[PDB]
Scaffold this active site. Structure first.
Site: not given
Ligand SMILES: [Zn+2]
Ligand SMILES: [Hg+2]
Length: 255
Positions: A60, A92, A102, A115
């Site tokens: 992911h 991301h 995000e 993050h």
């Molecule tokens: Zn994240």
């Protein structure tokens, strides 16, 4: 779960009913609506003694793991109460430069978002923190397409090594300090993880100031694979979750 058409974020609710919870992330940060809170102390980032171990392709995204057996890389101060230990960082990103982040700022989307995950040391281990309302502290950092980020290149070169889900590589002597912006001005609100299990254990700290990365640095991210080796290749792009309803929660600003 995934980010595909039939397993995308719009389906997460069936396996993780918390998806429709009270403090889900990410959100849109309405800057005119955000409340300037003067009782907020400045952020305390102590990463001088950080120890990176490896980089893994989890299917992911790719995670950079650090040794959290001791207070080596910590975050304290800000909206936080107590010491939070760095365990991992990930990104991301989007398929194009107009998306990837995000969290949004006045509905604006950035190329990617960083993050830095930390866990509250009174809880003992990551696993116990996720069972607490004040369990985690994540540091959000937006990335825009511009000039190259010298401090990100090490990450960028090792990607050839973890192309597919399951792959991992030794990755020591990495200083996160290199991914930090000049200013530590921030927005803070109560949320969750932005990927299943979507545990509503996070205190979000999103910095106002983004880091810029080159088109070429971002381009190597898009060469990743969701799939494991020897399976039809599906490029790791748009590994982001759409903004959620704020639902009463208020966003405080430290500036
Ligand atoms: Zn994240
Ligand atoms: Hg929790």
């Amino acid at each position: 779960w995934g980010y595909g058409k039939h397993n995308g974020p719009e389906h997460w609710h069936k396996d993780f009913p918390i998806a429709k919870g009270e403090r889900q992330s990410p959100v849109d940060i309405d800057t005119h609506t955000a409340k300037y809170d003067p009782s907020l102390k400045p952020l305390s980032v102590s990463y001088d003694q950080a120890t990176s171990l490896r980089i893994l392709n989890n299917g992911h995204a790719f995670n950079v793991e650090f040794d959290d057996s001791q207070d080596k890389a910590v975050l304290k101060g800000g909206p936080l109460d107590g010491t939070y230990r760095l365990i991992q960082f990930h990104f991301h990103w989007g398929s194009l430069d107009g998306q990837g982040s995000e969290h949004t700022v006045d509905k604006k989307k950035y190329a990617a978002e960083l993050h830095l995950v930390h866990w509250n040391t009174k809880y003992g281990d990551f696993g116990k923190a996720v069972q607490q309302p004040d369990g985690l502290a994540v540091l959000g950092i937006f990335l825009k397409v511009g000039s190259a980020k010298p401090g990100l290149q090490k990450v960028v070169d090792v990607l050839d090594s973890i192309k597919t889900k399951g792959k991992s590589a030794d990755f020591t002597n990495f200083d996160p300090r290199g991914l930090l912006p000049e200013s530590l001005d921030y927005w803070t609100y109560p949320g969750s993880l932005t990927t299943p299990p979507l545990l509503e254990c996070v205190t979000w700290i999103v910095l106002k100031e983004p880091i810029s990365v080159s088109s070429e640095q971002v381009l190597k991210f898009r060469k990743l694979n969701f799939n494991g080796e020897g399976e039809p290749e599906e490029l790791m792009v748009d590994n982001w979750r759409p903004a959620q309803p704020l639902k009463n929660r208020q966003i405080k600003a430290s500036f």
